[PDB]
Amino acid sequence: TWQVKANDRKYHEQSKYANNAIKTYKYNAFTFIPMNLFEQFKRAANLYFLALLILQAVPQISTLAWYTTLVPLLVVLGVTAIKDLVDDVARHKMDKEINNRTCEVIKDGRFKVAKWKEIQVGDVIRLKKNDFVPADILLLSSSEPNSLCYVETAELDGETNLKFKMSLEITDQYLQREDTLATFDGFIECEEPNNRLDKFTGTLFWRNTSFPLDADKILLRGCVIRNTDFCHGLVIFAGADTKIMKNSGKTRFKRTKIDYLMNYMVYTIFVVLILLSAGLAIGHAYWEAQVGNSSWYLYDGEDDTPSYRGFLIFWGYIIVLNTMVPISLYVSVEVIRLGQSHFINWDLQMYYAEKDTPAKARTTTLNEQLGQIHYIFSDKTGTLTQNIMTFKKCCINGQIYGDHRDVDFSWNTYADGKLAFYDHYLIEQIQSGKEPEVRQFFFLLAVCHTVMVDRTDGQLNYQAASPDEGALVNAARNFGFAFLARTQNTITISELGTERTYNVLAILDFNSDRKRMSIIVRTPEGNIKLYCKGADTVIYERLHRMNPTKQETQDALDIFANETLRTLCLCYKEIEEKEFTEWNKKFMAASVASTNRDEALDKVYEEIEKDLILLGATAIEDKLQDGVPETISKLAKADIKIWVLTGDKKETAENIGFACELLTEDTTICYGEDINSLLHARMENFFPPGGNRALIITGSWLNEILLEKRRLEAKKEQRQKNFVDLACECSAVICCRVTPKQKAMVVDLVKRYKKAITLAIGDGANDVNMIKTAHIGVGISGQEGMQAVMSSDYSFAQFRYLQRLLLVHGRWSYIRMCKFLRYFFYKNFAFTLVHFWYSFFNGYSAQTAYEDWFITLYNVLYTSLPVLLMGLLDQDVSDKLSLRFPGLYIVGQRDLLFNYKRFFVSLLHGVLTSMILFFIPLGAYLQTVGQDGEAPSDYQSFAVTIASALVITVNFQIGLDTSYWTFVNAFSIFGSIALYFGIMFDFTASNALRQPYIWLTIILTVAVCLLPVVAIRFLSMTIWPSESDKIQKHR
Amino acid sequence: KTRRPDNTAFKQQRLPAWQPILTAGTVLPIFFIIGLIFIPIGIGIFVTSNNIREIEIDYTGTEPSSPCNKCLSPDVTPCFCTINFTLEKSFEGNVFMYYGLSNFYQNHRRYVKSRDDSQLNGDSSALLNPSKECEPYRRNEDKPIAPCGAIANSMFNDTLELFLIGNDSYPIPIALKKKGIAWWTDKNVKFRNPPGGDNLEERFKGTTKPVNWLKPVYMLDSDPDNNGFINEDFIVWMRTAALPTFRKLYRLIERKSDLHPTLPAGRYSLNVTYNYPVHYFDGRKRMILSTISWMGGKNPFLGIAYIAVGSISFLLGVVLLVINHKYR
Ligand SMILES: CCCCCCCC/C=C/CCCCCCCC(=O)O[C@H](COC(=O)CCCCCCCCCCCCCCC)COP(=O)(O)OC[C@H](N)C(=O)O
Ligand SMILES: *[C@@H]1O[C@H](CO)[C@@H](O[C@@H]2O[C@H](CO)[C@@H](O[C@@H]3O[C@H](CO)[C@@H](O)[C@H](O)[C@@H]3O)[C@H](O)[C@H]2NC(C)=O)[C@H](O)[C@H]1NC(C)=O
Ligand SMILES: *[C@@H]1O[C@H](CO)[C@@H](O)[C@H](O)[C@H]1NC(C)=O
Ligand SMILES: *[C@@H]1O[C@H](CO)[C@@H](O)[C@H](O)[C@H]1NC(C)=O
Ligand SMILES: [Mg+2]
């Protein structure tokens, strides 16, 4: 059990306590270079090229120079190494800033300044207003009565509203002063460190008495102390034990599905490479036995048995056929990846003008995975919504206002200008004062609330625990009725610029079941009013007969509910003098603990709020980000399922779900109670909710549903799969009140039990764990912390830009990458397999069919640029057509462009091209090429003929593959051929290409390689046209 | 974050471009124009190749009952054979005399590399220091081999002569030019004698002959312009071949001054000095006489290949046309 001793730095120094310093970086200044263990082992290609470099080093077994393998290998390793270095160096800066944060500590006798690193468990600290909490501390005292404190848990959940916290009663009345804190010695036996944020189990042993502790007395590390001058607490969990850091996952190396596929494709190529080389090695051993040993012209000394001769070339043929997996493929992928990522940054349609922030591809490796997405997990506050909650409409008395009929707000000074009210009739009525209902309506908003004033630098800023009250009180200020300030016994409000101090005599509280609030305020004249406010259902249950506005407001509430506006009914009463005085004695008697204080308070509360007269109803708007409902529908047409994981309340999460149109009137909402019955039913036995189409679960229900010995592990494995199976067959899933770690476990659950590619989008530290867990992590810009942005792969400002990231950049990047991979293998299998066929005509001696200077420059000059441009400038359809037809995105979801079938078809294409490229020149030379004194039929001419036919064929193939023929694309395809035929015409080899037969052989070889392809490509689209083909055909 | 991205066609992915689509109006014709060009080309090559008079004589002497089997076991090193052949049709124009070798892997990796191109280029430093590349024939016993390597050592060294058996039965030797049988670049650029001196004897001082050569490289030919590394026969051999079955140019028979055929049809006898042993590895020596043609040599393969590929394009063109019409 965790034990904490106050003001004792050496109580448990007798390691298990973690110092308050954090460590998120991965590489030190020494263990950075050993990252090669990560680069080499994870990707088998890097190991293969390392084997080649070692293999080509030994002169005994060599056929190609090694300087052409080291330089590209350093580029492949270098670029990835620098990318990880800059990312990790950035993580060092974040840790340094957090660690170097300043605080105050009870050192010996006094409060002396210290950094966040120097904080340790059992350390008493003092925190001022607007200071970050440095560790999980037990609140002891504060600057305001009852040691009452407020915190902004923006990192635990994305909400900004203040959270209410208290301290122990005994500690409140003794630890107010610094001197008593210095000598404070309290022993705490609390729970072990954990990631649960809403629960805390512990007791404070102090003054020979035990006092239980709850979550309402513990301030966590991600909190910000607000609206309180100072507070004191002793650290309990520090550094890595803090619940925020337990709610944080590791930064993994994220790589794309295609990256994993290439590993499996490359494994097969190794098997063929060993089998081809071994088969040719065996043939040489046989050939050396029969023909080689009896060939006097081949004698070379160094008598080697044919078995040894066969052994040596096995490594020779490994080097000859090394480009079956070419290093140029991975050097070129990085160029493709970097270019595709800069198109996200350069996008003017993903650039937010007013905030002046473009998109940023913070990870350049995952471009083609944006075209693979199956699930999107998104935050609510700040991601789907703007986090702005304004007062839109009100049914004052009987009439409905805020209808743009006939604002400057200059008539009142307190008007900040945040409100965008357009109706002018309401403003006229307020100033006119003809109807007293209008004055009382906004007076109630400025009275019945728990909102709190700041009054900092002459600004009348408001802070509230409930955003609804904060919006209503802000609106009341704009309409003259400004809530100036409140003391314990009175509340001061400016009625149209006139100071008026009301002495409140009783403040009714708000509860989840109560669903309302009221307040008894005595006007200065002497009258007593019960200003009430709450939900429509509970309020109407406590009306009286004479109310003639029951029907009019009921219709107004329906109108407000139609446009998804949160509503509250307003009421007032006219308590007499003696009636309250008799009841005040009863109410005061109910304030004591007595037995429970819950039943007594509920009983007296119900009698208080009888016979209420209505003033109207309000309609608050929780603004959605622009283009959110249009984006959610658009991404749904791409068969992308969007789950909303939010740290907010269920009521607000569901309301935004309707506004986003994730939930509709057709959807039937399944709650946590409904799910548990079904999951249990399947356990004791596709789900019936397949037609229900909605699922709203709280973080508490997630723990029970996930249930977080050998048989127990099986139940854990089974229960998780059952929930994921049920949840995935729902149109919308909204998870509310989930911790940052619960956000990630939901992403991980879909990743494991569905093999789906997941995208996590959000803002703030709440979403960093799922941003780090998902295959693609997007950070919405706007938070000054920039914590979700910094941990994200991509980062733009508006949710609506998810359309262009997925349907344009992700869709194209998948097409361009798959096209690049399929061609790059073809052009190298068609190139390196000519040596395989020539082995049968040279004694399996590992002699190459090309000149040495052609083997080096093939992938460098003659076939390099055209595929890079096709991998950067190829578009099947324009951006406008990409967004008009989201159904094109499904092509990448199902992996229809790169597969085992598609990869092996490119090997068959390459194997047949190399077969044709060798055996037509062979036939044309076995008998007679144009033969005279100045003639080919040499080995140089044979190598020139295949190289010329190979360069033209592969460069013509990329022309067929290319669908976006820019001038740069055209120049490179014909420029690559023109460069090959320019280098070998003095800017021997040129001699072959001046003969009619040498050019007739090349023309024949090219056509036999290309014409069957043109037929198949045309035949493929005519009987099996693709979605892109139909759009382009009908374009 | 930063300022607005600048608006350019490349950066906004809106470069002016052309979107080709494989329509029936574009692929159907090329499958017919290609077929219409590959058929006449195939006929043109095929007919011209058949119009070449060529006689090939295999004097390896492996089979018994042949008048050259005595040289397979040369008790006396100088061996001679006489092969009688007849030309039904007289040859016309220039006639090239090749020698053919079969099952002779001149494209072996262990063999193609066995040379010192620097020494052949006429490098004094490399003349006495042949590279390790020609390791097996670097130095004979004490001093370096001038034509180092297995390629130069195993040089074809049979002497072939042609005699015309006239009506009088008296053989008529036919003039055979041994010049101009190598590439112009080979003679004047790639292959050169070592610098300095005027006599080839002095230039090649302190350099032994190859092991298998009977006489040094000094007197490969009496003509000073055809001896040394610039010797035509030596140059033709060192220019390696691509496949085991190959033929190399040996002699030139220029056009006769008179209008009569260069080799009038009749009786001919090949007098060959059997020196090169090839029967150890089942090789077969040959002698080829061919007549020049303006359209290259005699290649029946290409002509047939164009006919096949040219005809298949029509089949694909018709099949694609028929398939389109069904799915139009
Ligand atoms: C007249 C008009 C002509 C216009 C076009 C002409 C072409 C000009 C092309 C220019 C771009 C060159 C691109 C080079 C790609 C690298 C391929 C490669 O790597 O080929 C390694 C050898 O490459 C090297 O020697 C070093 C390359 C450094 C690359 C520099 C950075 C990237 C430049 C990007 C340029 C971007 C340009 C702007 C883009 C908008 C051999 O692969 P490999 O053979 O598979 O294996 C051999 C075998 N394993 C072994 O052990 O021997
Ligand atoms: C024509 O070329 C052939 C090679 O194909 C020559 O035959 C080779 O002759 C050399 C000698 O000059 C042989 O090397 C050694 O000869 C000594 C005798 O001096 C002998 O004792 C060794 O055992 C060894 O054979 C070489 O073996 C031999 N080649 C073969 C395949 O047997 C031939 O001499 C050349 N003739 C002319 C006229 O140029
Ligand atoms: C070939 O000709 C020579 C000389 O004319 C003669 O001795 C020999 O018998 C002839 N052989 C054949 C097979 O005709
Ligand atoms: C063939 O040539 C050799 C050498 O040049 C010569 O001695 C012989 O008389 C010629 N005629 C034959 C062998 O019939
Ligand atoms: Mg948020």
mmCIF file with all atom_site columns, all heavy atoms in Angstrom, chain B residues 117-131:
data_model
loop_
_atom_site.group_PDB
_atom_site.id
_atom_site.type_symbol
_atom_site.label_atom_id
_atom_site.label_alt_id
_atom_site.label_comp_id
_atom_site.label_asym_id
_atom_site.label_entity_id
_atom_site.label_seq_id
_atom_site.pdbx_PDB_ins_code
_atom_site.Cartn_x
_atom_site.Cartn_y
_atom_site.Cartn_z
_atom_site.occupancy
_atom_site.B_iso_or_equiv
_atom_site.pdbx_formal_charge
_atom_site.auth_seq_id
_atom_site.auth_comp_id
_atom_site.auth_asym_id
_atom_site.auth_atom_id
_atom_site.pdbx_PDB_model_num
ATOM 1   N N   . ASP B 1 117 ? 43.065 -4.963 -70.733 1.00 0.00 ? 117 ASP B N   1
ATOM 2   C CA  . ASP B 1 117 ? 42.751 -3.951 -71.736 1.00 0.00 ? 117 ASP B CA  1
ATOM 3   C C   . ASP B 1 117 ? 43.770 -2.819 -71.728 1.00 0.00 ? 117 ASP B C   1
ATOM 4   O O   . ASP B 1 117 ? 44.035 -2.219 -72.776 1.00 0.00 ? 117 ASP B O   1
ATOM 5   C CB  . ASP B 1 117 ? 41.347 -3.397 -71.499 1.00 0.00 ? 117 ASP B CB  1
ATOM 6   C CG  . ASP B 1 117 ? 40.261 -4.414 -71.790 1.00 0.00 ? 117 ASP B CG  1
ATOM 7   O OD1 . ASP B 1 117 ? 40.481 -5.293 -72.649 1.00 0.00 ? 117 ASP B OD1 1
ATOM 8   O OD2 . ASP B 1 117 ? 39.187 -4.337 -71.158 1.00 0.00 ? 117 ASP B OD2 1
ATOM 9   N N   . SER B 1 118 ? 44.344 -2.509 -70.564 1.00 0.00 ? 118 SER B N   1
ATOM 10  C CA  . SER B 1 118 ? 45.353 -1.457 -70.501 1.00 0.00 ? 118 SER B CA  1
ATOM 11  C C   . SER B 1 118 ? 46.581 -1.825 -71.324 1.00 0.00 ? 118 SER B C   1
ATOM 12  O O   . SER B 1 118 ? 47.122 -0.987 -72.056 1.00 0.00 ? 118 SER B O   1
ATOM 13  C CB  . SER B 1 118 ? 45.741 -1.194 -69.048 1.00 0.00 ? 118 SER B CB  1
ATOM 14  O OG  . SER B 1 118 ? 46.687 -0.143 -68.956 1.00 0.00 ? 118 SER B OG  1
ATOM 15  N N   . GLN B 1 119 ? 47.037 -3.074 -71.216 1.00 0.00 ? 119 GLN B N   1
ATOM 16  C CA  . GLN B 1 119 ? 48.198 -3.507 -71.984 1.00 0.00 ? 119 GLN B CA  1
ATOM 17  C C   . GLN B 1 119 ? 47.903 -3.510 -73.478 1.00 0.00 ? 119 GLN B C   1
ATOM 18  O O   . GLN B 1 119 ? 48.740 -3.084 -74.282 1.00 0.00 ? 119 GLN B O   1
ATOM 19  C CB  . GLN B 1 119 ? 48.639 -4.894 -71.522 1.00 0.00 ? 119 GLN B CB  1
ATOM 20  C CG  . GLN B 1 119 ? 49.661 -5.555 -72.424 1.00 0.00 ? 119 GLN B CG  1
ATOM 21  C CD  . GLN B 1 119 ? 50.417 -6.664 -71.726 1.00 0.00 ? 119 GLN B CD  1
ATOM 22  O OE1 . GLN B 1 119 ? 51.638 -6.757 -71.828 1.00 0.00 ? 119 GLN B OE1 1
ATOM 23  N NE2 . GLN B 1 119 ? 49.690 -7.521 -71.018 1.00 0.00 ? 119 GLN B NE2 1
ATOM 24  N N   . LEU B 1 120 ? 46.722 -3.993 -73.870 1.00 0.00 ? 120 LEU B N   1
ATOM 25  C CA  . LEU B 1 120 ? 46.370 -4.020 -75.285 1.00 0.00 ? 120 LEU B CA  1
ATOM 26  C C   . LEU B 1 120 ? 46.293 -2.617 -75.869 1.00 0.00 ? 120 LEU B C   1
ATOM 27  O O   . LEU B 1 120 ? 46.570 -2.422 -77.057 1.00 0.00 ? 120 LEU B O   1
ATOM 28  C CB  . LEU B 1 120 ? 45.038 -4.746 -75.481 1.00 0.00 ? 120 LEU B CB  1
ATOM 29  C CG  . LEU B 1 120 ? 44.978 -6.192 -74.991 1.00 0.00 ? 120 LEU B CG  1
ATOM 30  C CD1 . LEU B 1 120 ? 43.550 -6.704 -75.034 1.00 0.00 ? 120 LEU B CD1 1
ATOM 31  C CD2 . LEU B 1 120 ? 45.891 -7.080 -75.819 1.00 0.00 ? 120 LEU B CD2 1
ATOM 32  N N   . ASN B 1 121 ? 45.917 -1.630 -75.055 1.00 0.00 ? 121 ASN B N   1
ATOM 33  C CA  . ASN B 1 121 ? 45.835 -0.254 -75.523 1.00 0.00 ? 121 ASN B CA  1
ATOM 34  C C   . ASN B 1 121 ? 47.197 0.337  -75.863 1.00 0.00 ? 121 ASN B C   1
ATOM 35  O O   . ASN B 1 121 ? 47.251 1.397  -76.496 1.00 0.00 ? 121 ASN B O   1
ATOM 36  C CB  . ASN B 1 121 ? 45.147 0.611  -74.465 1.00 0.00 ? 121 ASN B CB  1
ATOM 37  C CG  . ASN B 1 121 ? 44.876 2.019  -74.949 1.00 0.00 ? 121 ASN B CG  1
ATOM 38  O OD1 . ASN B 1 121 ? 44.567 2.237  -76.121 1.00 0.00 ? 121 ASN B OD1 1
ATOM 39  N ND2 . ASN B 1 121 ? 44.993 2.988  -74.049 1.00 0.00 ? 121 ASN B ND2 1
ATOM 40  N N   . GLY B 1 122 ? 48.288 -0.315 -75.468 1.00 0.00 ? 122 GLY B N   1
ATOM 41  C CA  . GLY B 1 122 ? 49.618 0.198  -75.731 1.00 0.00 ? 122 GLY B CA  1
ATOM 42  C C   . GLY B 1 122 ? 50.155 1.009  -74.572 1.00 0.00 ? 122 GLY B C   1
ATOM 43  O O   . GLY B 1 122 ? 50.597 2.147  -74.753 1.00 0.00 ? 122 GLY B O   1
ATOM 44  N N   . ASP B 1 123 ? 50.108 0.435  -73.373 1.00 0.00 ? 123 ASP B N   1
ATOM 45  C CA  . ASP B 1 123 ? 50.582 1.091  -72.162 1.00 0.00 ? 123 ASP B CA  1
ATOM 46  C C   . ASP B 1 123 ? 51.928 0.478  -71.797 1.00 0.00 ? 123 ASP B C   1
ATOM 47  O O   . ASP B 1 123 ? 52.022 -0.732 -71.561 1.00 0.00 ? 123 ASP B O   1
ATOM 48  C CB  . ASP B 1 123 ? 49.561 0.927  -71.032 1.00 0.00 ? 123 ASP B CB  1
ATOM 49  C CG  . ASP B 1 123 ? 50.028 1.510  -69.700 1.00 0.00 ? 123 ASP B CG  1
ATOM 50  O OD1 . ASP B 1 123 ? 51.222 1.409  -69.349 1.00 0.00 ? 123 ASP B OD1 1
ATOM 51  O OD2 . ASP B 1 123 ? 49.173 2.071  -68.982 1.00 0.00 ? 123 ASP B OD2 1
ATOM 52  N N   . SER B 1 124 ? 52.969 1.314  -71.753 1.00 0.00 ? 124 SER B N   1
ATOM 53  C CA  . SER B 1 124 ? 54.300 0.818  -71.415 1.00 0.00 ? 124 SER B CA  1
ATOM 54  C C   . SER B 1 124 ? 54.341 0.270  -69.996 1.00 0.00 ? 124 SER B C   1
ATOM 55  O O   . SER B 1 124 ? 54.951 -0.776 -69.744 1.00 0.00 ? 124 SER B O   1
ATOM 56  C CB  . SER B 1 124 ? 55.332 1.933  -71.585 1.00 0.00 ? 124 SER B CB  1
ATOM 57  O OG  . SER B 1 124 ? 55.513 2.257  -72.951 1.00 0.00 ? 124 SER B OG  1
ATOM 58  N N   . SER B 1 125 ? 53.701 0.963  -69.050 1.00 0.00 ? 125 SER B N   1
ATOM 59  C CA  . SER B 1 125 ? 53.717 0.505  -67.665 1.00 0.00 ? 125 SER B CA  1
ATOM 60  C C   . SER B 1 125 ? 53.040 -0.852 -67.526 1.00 0.00 ? 125 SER B C   1
ATOM 61  O O   . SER B 1 125 ? 53.535 -1.731 -66.812 1.00 0.00 ? 125 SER B O   1
ATOM 62  C CB  . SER B 1 125 ? 53.037 1.536  -66.763 1.00 0.00 ? 125 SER B CB  1
ATOM 63  O OG  . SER B 1 125 ? 52.947 1.064  -65.430 1.00 0.00 ? 125 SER B OG  1
ATOM 64  N N   . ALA B 1 126 ? 51.907 -1.043 -68.203 1.00 0.00 ? 126 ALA B N   1
ATOM 65  C CA  . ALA B 1 126 ? 51.192 -2.310 -68.141 1.00 0.00 ? 126 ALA B CA  1
ATOM 66  C C   . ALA B 1 126 ? 51.790 -3.375 -69.048 1.00 0.00 ? 126 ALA B C   1
ATOM 67  O O   . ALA B 1 126 ? 51.455 -4.554 -68.889 1.00 0.00 ? 126 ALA B O   1
ATOM 68  C CB  . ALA B 1 126 ? 49.721 -2.100 -68.506 1.00 0.00 ? 126 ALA B CB  1
ATOM 69  N N   . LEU B 1 127 ? 52.657 -2.997 -69.988 1.00 0.00 ? 127 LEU B N   1
ATOM 70  C CA  . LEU B 1 127 ? 53.279 -3.989 -70.861 1.00 0.00 ? 127 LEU B CA  1
ATOM 71  C C   . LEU B 1 127 ? 54.128 -4.963 -70.054 1.00 0.00 ? 127 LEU B C   1
ATOM 72  O O   . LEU B 1 127 ? 54.062 -6.180 -70.261 1.00 0.00 ? 127 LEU B O   1
ATOM 73  C CB  . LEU B 1 127 ? 54.124 -3.290 -71.927 1.00 0.00 ? 127 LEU B CB  1
ATOM 74  C CG  . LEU B 1 127 ? 54.954 -4.190 -72.846 1.00 0.00 ? 127 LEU B CG  1
ATOM 75  C CD1 . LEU B 1 127 ? 54.069 -5.196 -73.563 1.00 0.00 ? 127 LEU B CD1 1
ATOM 76  C CD2 . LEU B 1 127 ? 55.728 -3.349 -73.845 1.00 0.00 ? 127 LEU B CD2 1
ATOM 77  N N   . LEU B 1 128 ? 54.928 -4.444 -69.128 1.00 0.00 ? 128 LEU B N   1
ATOM 78  C CA  . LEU B 1 128 ? 55.745 -5.267 -68.246 1.00 0.00 ? 128 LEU B CA  1
ATOM 79  C C   . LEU B 1 128 ? 55.070 -5.555 -66.912 1.00 0.00 ? 128 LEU B C   1
ATOM 80  O O   . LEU B 1 128 ? 55.655 -6.256 -66.079 1.00 0.00 ? 128 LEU B O   1
ATOM 81  C CB  . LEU B 1 128 ? 57.097 -4.591 -68.000 1.00 0.00 ? 128 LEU B CB  1
ATOM 82  C CG  . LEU B 1 128 ? 57.970 -4.390 -69.241 1.00 0.00 ? 128 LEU B CG  1
ATOM 83  C CD1 . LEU B 1 128 ? 57.901 -2.950 -69.724 1.00 0.00 ? 128 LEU B CD1 1
ATOM 84  C CD2 . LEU B 1 128 ? 59.408 -4.794 -68.953 1.00 0.00 ? 128 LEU B CD2 1
ATOM 85  N N   . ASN B 1 129 ? 53.868 -5.032 -66.685 1.00 0.00 ? 129 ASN B N   1
ATOM 86  C CA  . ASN B 1 129 ? 53.103 -5.286 -65.464 1.00 0.00 ? 129 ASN B CA  1
ATOM 87  C C   . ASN B 1 129 ? 51.654 -5.584 -65.832 1.00 0.00 ? 129 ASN B C   1
ATOM 88  O O   . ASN B 1 129 ? 50.759 -4.765 -65.592 1.00 0.00 ? 129 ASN B O   1
ATOM 89  C CB  . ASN B 1 129 ? 53.189 -4.096 -64.508 1.00 0.00 ? 129 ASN B CB  1
ATOM 90  C CG  . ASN B 1 129 ? 52.505 -4.364 -63.182 1.00 0.00 ? 129 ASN B CG  1
ATOM 91  O OD1 . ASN B 1 129 ? 52.127 -5.496 -62.884 1.00 0.00 ? 129 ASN B OD1 1
ATOM 92  N ND2 . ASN B 1 129 ? 52.343 -3.320 -62.378 1.00 0.00 ? 129 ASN B ND2 1
ATOM 93  N N   . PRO B 1 130 ? 51.387 -6.747 -66.427 1.00 0.00 ? 130 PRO B N   1
ATOM 94  C CA  . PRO B 1 130 ? 49.995 -7.117 -66.705 1.00 0.00 ? 130 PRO B CA  1
ATOM 95  C C   . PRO B 1 130 ? 49.191 -7.214 -65.417 1.00 0.00 ? 130 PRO B C   1
ATOM 96  O O   . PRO B 1 130 ? 49.696 -7.643 -64.378 1.00 0.00 ? 130 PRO B O   1
ATOM 97  C CB  . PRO B 1 130 ? 50.115 -8.476 -67.404 1.00 0.00 ? 130 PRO B CB  1
ATOM 98  C CG  . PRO B 1 130 ? 51.528 -8.563 -67.864 1.00 0.00 ? 130 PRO B CG  1
ATOM 99  C CD  . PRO B 1 130 ? 52.331 -7.782 -66.881 1.00 0.00 ? 130 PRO B CD  1
ATOM 100 N N   . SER B 1 131 ? 47.926 -6.815 -65.496 1.00 0.00 ? 131 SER B N   1
ATOM 101 C CA  . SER B 1 131 ? 47.086 -6.774 -64.312 1.00 0.00 ? 131 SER B CA  1
ATOM 102 C C   . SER B 1 131 ? 46.816 -8.182 -63.790 1.00 0.00 ? 131 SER B C   1
ATOM 103 O O   . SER B 1 131 ? 46.920 -9.177 -64.512 1.00 0.00 ? 131 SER B O   1
ATOM 104 C CB  . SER B 1 131 ? 45.762 -6.075 -64.617 1.00 0.00 ? 131 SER B CB  1
ATOM 105 O OG  . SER B 1 131 ? 45.037 -6.771 -65.615 1.00 0.00 ? 131 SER B OG  1
#
